[PDB]
Amino acid sequence: RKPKTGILMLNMGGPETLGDVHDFLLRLFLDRDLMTLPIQNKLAPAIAKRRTPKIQEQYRRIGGGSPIKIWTSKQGEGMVKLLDELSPNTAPHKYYIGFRYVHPLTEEAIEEMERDGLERAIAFTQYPQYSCSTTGSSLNAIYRYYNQVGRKPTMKWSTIDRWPTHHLLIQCFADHILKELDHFPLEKRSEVVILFSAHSLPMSVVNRGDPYPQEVSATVQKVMERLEYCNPYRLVWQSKVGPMPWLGPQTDESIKGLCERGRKNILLVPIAFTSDHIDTLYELDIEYSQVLAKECGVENIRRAESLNGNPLFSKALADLVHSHIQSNELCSKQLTLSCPLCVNPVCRETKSFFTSQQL
Amino acid sequence: RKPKTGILMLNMGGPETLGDVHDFLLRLFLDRDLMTLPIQNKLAPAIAKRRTPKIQEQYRRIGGGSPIKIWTSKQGEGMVKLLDELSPNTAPHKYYIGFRYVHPLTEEAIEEMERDGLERAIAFTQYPQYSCSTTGSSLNAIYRYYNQVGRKPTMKWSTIDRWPTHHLLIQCFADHILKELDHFPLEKRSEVVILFSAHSLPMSVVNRGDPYPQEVSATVQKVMERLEYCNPYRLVWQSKVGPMPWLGPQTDESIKGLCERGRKNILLVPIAFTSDHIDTLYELDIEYSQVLAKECGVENIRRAESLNGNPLFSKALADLVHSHIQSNELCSKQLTLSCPLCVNPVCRETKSFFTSQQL
Numbered sequence: 167r168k169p170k171t172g173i174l175m176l177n178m179g180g181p182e183t184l185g186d187v188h189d190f191l192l193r194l195f196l197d198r199d200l201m202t203l204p205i206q207n208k209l210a211p212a213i214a215k216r217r218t219p220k221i222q223e224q225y226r227r228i229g230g231g232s233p234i235k236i237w238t239s240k241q242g243e244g245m246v247k248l249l250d251e252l253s254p255n256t257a258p259h260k261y262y263i264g265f266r267y268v269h270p271l272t273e274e275a276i277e278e279m280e281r282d283g284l285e286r287a288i289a290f291t292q293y294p295q296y297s298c299s300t301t302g303s304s305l306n307a308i309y310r311y312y313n314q315v316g317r318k319p320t321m322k323w324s325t326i327d328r329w330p331t332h333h334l335l336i337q338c339f340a341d342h343i344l345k346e347l348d349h350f351p352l353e354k355r356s357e358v359v360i361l362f363s364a365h366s367l368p369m370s371v372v373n374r375g376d377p378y379p380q381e382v383s384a385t386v387q388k389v390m391e392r393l394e395y396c397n398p399y400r401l402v403w404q405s406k407v408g409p410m411p412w413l414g415p416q417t418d419e420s421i422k423g424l425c426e427r428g429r430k431n432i433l434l435v436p437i438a439f440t441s442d443h444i445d446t447l448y449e450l451d452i453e454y455s456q457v458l459a460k461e462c463g464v465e466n467i468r469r470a471e472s473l474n475g476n477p478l479f480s481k482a483l484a485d486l487v488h489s490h491i492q493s494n495e496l497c498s499k500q501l502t503l504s505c506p507l508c509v510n511p512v513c514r515e516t517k518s519f520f521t522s523q524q525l
Numbered sequence: 526r527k528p529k530t531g532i533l534m535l536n537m538g539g540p541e542t543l544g545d546v547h548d549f550l551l552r553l554f555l556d557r558d559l560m561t562l563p564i565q566n567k568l569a570p571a572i573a574k575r576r577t578p579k580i581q582e583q584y585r586r587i588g589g590g591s592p593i594k595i596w597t598s599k600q601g602e603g604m605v606k607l608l609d610e611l612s613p614n615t616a617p618h619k620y621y622i623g624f625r626y627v628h629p630l631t632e633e634a635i636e637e638m639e640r641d642g643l644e645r646a647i648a649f650t651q652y653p654q655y656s657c658s659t660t661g662s663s664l665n666a667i668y669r670y671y672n673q674v675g676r677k678p679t680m681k682w683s684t685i686d687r688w689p690t691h692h693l694l695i696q697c698f699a700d701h702i703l704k705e706l707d708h709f710p711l712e713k714r715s716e717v718v719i720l721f722s723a724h725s726l727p728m729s730v731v732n733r734g735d736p737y738p739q740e741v742s743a744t745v746q747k748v749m750e751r752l753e754y755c756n757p758y759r760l761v762w763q764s765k766v767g768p769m770p771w772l773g774p775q776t777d778e779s780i781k782g783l784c785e786r787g788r789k790n791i792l793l794v795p796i797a798f799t800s801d802h803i804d805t806l807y808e809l810d811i812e813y814s815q816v817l818a819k820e821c822g823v824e825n826i827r828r829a830e831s832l833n834g835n836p837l838f839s840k841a842l843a844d845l846v847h848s849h850i851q852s853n854e855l856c857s858k859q860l861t862l863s864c865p866l867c868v869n870p871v872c873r874e875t876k877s878f879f880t881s882q883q884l
């Protein structure tokens with residue numbers, strides 16, 4: 167029985183195998199909507215060469231690749247099963263994975279979608295919190311795909327472009343936190359501080375007007391109310407590649423900060439991502455939770471399990487898609503505004519792609 | 526009857542006259558809690574005496590003073606009128622004003638509270654979103670008082686140190702946003718961009734783990750939630766004195782930037798303050814809403830009214846105090862945790878003054 171509604175799940179991606187690291191690093195240092203224009207164009211190729219081996223060693227220490235595709239397919243199969251029951255009018259649903267820097271690419275997903283002859287396609291970013299660097303880049307890749315091929319879509323397009331507060335996402339984060347709190351010694355629980363950590367962004371992207379840190383802040387507050395403020399917390403930010411100023415505090419200087427201050431029981435929370443990856447399994451778990459925490463004299467540092475297979479997350483995906491269908495919306499009202507200081511002619515075109523189709 | 530419960534309302538304050546300007550900038554600048562520009566001290570009276578008449582000119586542009594004290598007294602009064610009726614067991618309530626930089630100073634209201642022989646004293650920041658530089662500074666002044674004067678307090682103390690998402694607070698904003706909305710030309714109402722505007726912070730303070738920017742973002746999320754996301758929005762940052770990097774985008778820069786990109790219908794919401802003042806009356810109404818504005822070819826730019834004498838806002842302050850009383854909480858859970866990069870030795874003892882008091 168033929169598919170009617172296709173759900174395009176977007177995330178930058180990750181190299182599934184060690185061999186993949188190279189073009190992942192290349193497609194990414196090429197992506198204009200993510201980063202700065204330093205005669206790049208063909209400067210990325212050099213960088214991909216140098217860094218591949220180093221990054222590769224990083225992926226080596228976590229089973230040799232990212233688990234994103236595994237997780238994404240799991241989440242999507244669950245979502246599809248719920249939606250075939252909850253929304254029979256749109257009854258045959260299909261998901262499609264669309265990665266921005268690894269296979270199956272955004273570009274390869276849309277081509278399989280057009281081939282399937284859908285009545286409907288939805289661009290469902292898997293980033294709950296919006297950045298022009300993240301959701302922006304994936305949505306641009308859709309407009310451009312149809313620019314490149316030179317023909318309007320053969321199906322109605324819409325996007326669920328953000329969801330920083332969906333209540334089930336919030337239930338999921340709060341459940342995973344209670345159950346980790348449960349492993350701290352009963353006498354170390356109440357002093358546990360909850361450190362919410364998200365991927366940072368260059369201050370140049372922040373000062374542009376980028377909506378991401380306001381939205382991430384919205385997720386955090388919403389999880390803390392649901393936790394009834396049981397523990398103190400702080401939102402801090404992980405990564406900061408480069409020379410450039412990024413928004414802080416950094417997650418790393420915060421852990422070392424807390425320790426040097428008699429705060430030694432810390433619960434790390436990956437709050438901007440929906441599954442495991444190099445940021446969580448390498449950067450946070452190995453590296454900050456093992457190497458740095460040892461040097462600091464941490465008594466206990468735990469990491470809230472990522473959502474990954476939590477069935478309640480599938481229920482969250484389905485509920486987003488269904489509410490999105492019933493509301494007949496084209497995109498959030500936030501997508502209709504660009505950053506006050508946007509210097510990107512494509513943003514306004516992606517937006518027009520969703521607001522002004524024909525269906 | 527004799528006052529039983531005292532509500533110490535804390536605010537930074539502002540000069541009620543031109544005569545008061547120089548005294549205000551002196552203390553403002555002599556405040557290590559606020560800035561570590563006391564790089565060399567007595568460089569404070571240097572800048573005070575310096576900039577006094579420039580600032581005096583600003584104040585003349587709006588009536589000859591800051592209205593902060595008139596509005597706080599009126600708020601203080603509706604609040605007391607409400608608490609007597611709604612919490613009769615905490616007898617007659619009385620409000621005291623504790624400005625950081627002008628009369629009445631925090632020290633002056635304490636010495637009165639001490640004399641009034643109250644049963645209970647409540648330190649009630651008038652900043653919804655906590656920052657170490659505002660409320661933290663103001664709480665530290667209470668702890669410094671007692672230290673200075675070298676005796677234990679004669680009354681039981683607690684603090685309401687933050688309230689960024691209180692439901693009545695949010696309704697005031699959504700109500701004010703809505704009424705300013707109706708005043709735009711009808712066929713433009715849906716293209717208005719809502720620019721929420723808070724005092725910025727040095728990157729040095731944000732990057733140290735100041736909680737403010739996270740909380741501010743929480744206040745914005747709730748407002749838009751109650752508005753059902755009826756217009757698109759951004760959260761930007763105003764004021765900003767000096768040459769080191771602060772938290773942007775900047776209001777002015779974003780207003781400008783929007784107008785050049787086609788978005789010439791703008792509503793300002795001063796989201797981090799409850800009263801009209803220099804930042805609202807001069808920096809926003811004039812310089813943003815006139816000079817820079819009509820100069821960019823703004824079609825319409827309005828500003829939602831300050832909370833001021835809204836009767837719903839007094840109800841918010843009494844509601845917070847009532848709940849505080851029934852909670853028996855000494856301070857928010859947040860307060861019990863210092864910035865992870867806190868360097869101010871005062872912070873820790875101000876914690877214990879509220880948590881570990883000897884009455």
Ligand code: HEM
Pocket residue numbers: 179180181194200201232297299300364365366367368371378407438439442443444445
């Ligand atoms: C414009 C700002 C951004 C820049 C410059 C950037 C850049 C990069 C780069 C170069 C890598 C490769 C890993 C490395 O070289 O260390 C990476 C990895 C990663 N980034 Fe970002 N990114 C940005 C925004 C974001 C945001 C907002 C998120 C939010 C979730 C994010 C999530 C991730 C994840 C999950 C990985 C690891 C992927 C895997 O396991 O395969 N990025 N980023």
Ligand code: HEM
Pocket residue numbers: 537538539540559560580591656658659723724725726727730737764766797798802803804
């Ligand atoms: C540590 C970071 C901060 C610094 C260094 C700072 C510095 C200053 C300075 C020097 C002024 C006077 C401007 C002038 O003389 O023209 C000022 C004004 C003001 N600030 Fe800040 N500020 C900080 C954070 C904040 C925050 C977070 C708030 C509340 C959201 C705030 C509320 C105000 C208000 C209401 C004024 C108006 C002053 C007046 O009424 O004359 N400040 N700030």
Ligand code: FES
Pocket residue numbers: 298302374376503504505508509510513514
């Ligand atoms: S950079 Fe945000 S809309 Fe273009």
Ligand code: FES
Pocket residue numbers: 657661735862863864866867868869872
């Ligand atoms: S500077 Fe925030 S706890 Fe001291």
